[PDB]
């Protein structure tokens, strides 16, 4: 379990690292957005736990 | 030989120095008393270098320095200013309240109510830049240090019951497009110098 | 557009909202202009409900409240002058240096230049209402600390580095100079009663 949330605080800041490097760009969060699919989904531990 | 000032424009320049900025918001009684005078403001304010400032479009008063006839010199050498000058880390929190403000203000249009914030999304805002210590305890006092020393400036009122803040919309003329590109310039000069 | 104050009173009125007091003694050019420009000044101040009283024998400027000549309102209340008590150590002290003061009027006359006195004077003399609080050292950096908060209002001088200090003639303007005399004589005879 303490691992998982390890896992999950760590696929959050490798998506708002990104979100602020792309100074210029959209795509990469409406294609997001618009899908209601876990936003901060990680599979190699959050599809096995859940 | 003796003329005062008429009394009701001297409390509300009193009143407007005393808090620094004045709203519709709050205070609409003085308020409207500036916004119908602003030359007798703005030539009481005139000896001691402040000048008034206006936003009909909110409803937000401010005073600002000056540098007529004495131009350059720094802002904040000014001898009345009474408060230290901006912190970079608070600079950063400045930056993020003003991005939720552009959010709110686009979404809802300009000076529609108020524009609120919950103090959860600004947790993990500065959580990418300041750092993780794993203790929400601490990143919560660090967090609550910078918005109090920000109420120093005016620019938030304090957490409330619902651990919520109000972004007080002077926030929109301290982080414009000359200040924020002058500020860019001296972050990307210090870039530079770290390489 | 509009003619500007000019930069010397400008400066003056400034500084003198800054400090609360000017001194020929210290600044020689400042002073000297707003004697020459007085109705300029009590107009620039007129508006904000401030206005200075001129002490020609001491050669001291101080802002005080200029409100109405006993209105309802018997006493003065203030937007920008936050009234302030000081706490008890404080109050002693004031009131020791006030004594210092008119005793030393009284013999080398009013506006005399003030005799220098050493901190090592002062000390048994703060000794005689507090007792020791246990090592010189503690009372000397009491005493020192005292010095420094009381500079803040402009009452003494910073220490020299022989380590006196002067009596600065604001000390005579004080709000209501009964009061010190009153709780000085009255701890200085409870001593005696309890002794």
Same mark, same amino acid.
């Given at each position: ?9 760590? #696929? ?26 876990? #936003? ?11 | ?40 403001? *703005? ?31 720094? !802002? @904040? ?26 959010? @709110? !203000? ?38 609550? *240090? ?10 938030? *009122? ?27 310039? @001296? ?7 770290? *390489?």
């Amino acid at each position: 379990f303490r691992r998982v949330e390890d896992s999950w605080r760590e #696929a959050d800041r490798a998506l708002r690292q990104s979100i602020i490097g792309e100074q210029y760009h959209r795509g990469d969060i409406v294609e997001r957005l618009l899908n209601d699919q876990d #936003a901060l989904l990680n599979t190699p531990e959050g599809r096995v736990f859940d | 030989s003796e003329t005062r000032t008429l009394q009701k424009i001297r409390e509300a320049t009193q009143e407007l120095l005393k808090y620094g900025l004045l709203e519709e918001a709050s205070k609409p009684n003085l308020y409207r008393i500036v916004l119908s005078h602003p030359e007798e403001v *703005t030539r009481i304010l005139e000896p001691l270098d402040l000048d008034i400032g206006i936003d009909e479009i909110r409803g937000l008063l401010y005073v600002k320095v000056r540098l007529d006839e004495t131009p350059a010199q720094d !802002e @904040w050498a000014h001898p009345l200013v009474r408060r230290q000058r901006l912190n970079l880390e608070q600079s950063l929190l400045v930056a993020i309240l003003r991005q939720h403000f552009v959010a @709110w !203000e686009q979404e809802s249009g300009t000076g529609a109510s108020q524009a609120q914030i919950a103090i959860d999304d600004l947790l993990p805002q500065l959580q990418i830049y300041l750092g993780d210590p794993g203790s929400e305890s601490k990143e919560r006092t660090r967090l609550l *240090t910078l918005l109090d020393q920000l109420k120093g400036h005016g620019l938030v *009122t304090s957490p409330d019951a619902h651990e919520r803040i109000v972004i007080r919309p002077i926030i929109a003329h301290l982080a414009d497009p000359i200040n924020l590109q002058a500020l860019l310039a @001296w972050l990307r000069e210090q870039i530079a110098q770290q *390489t």
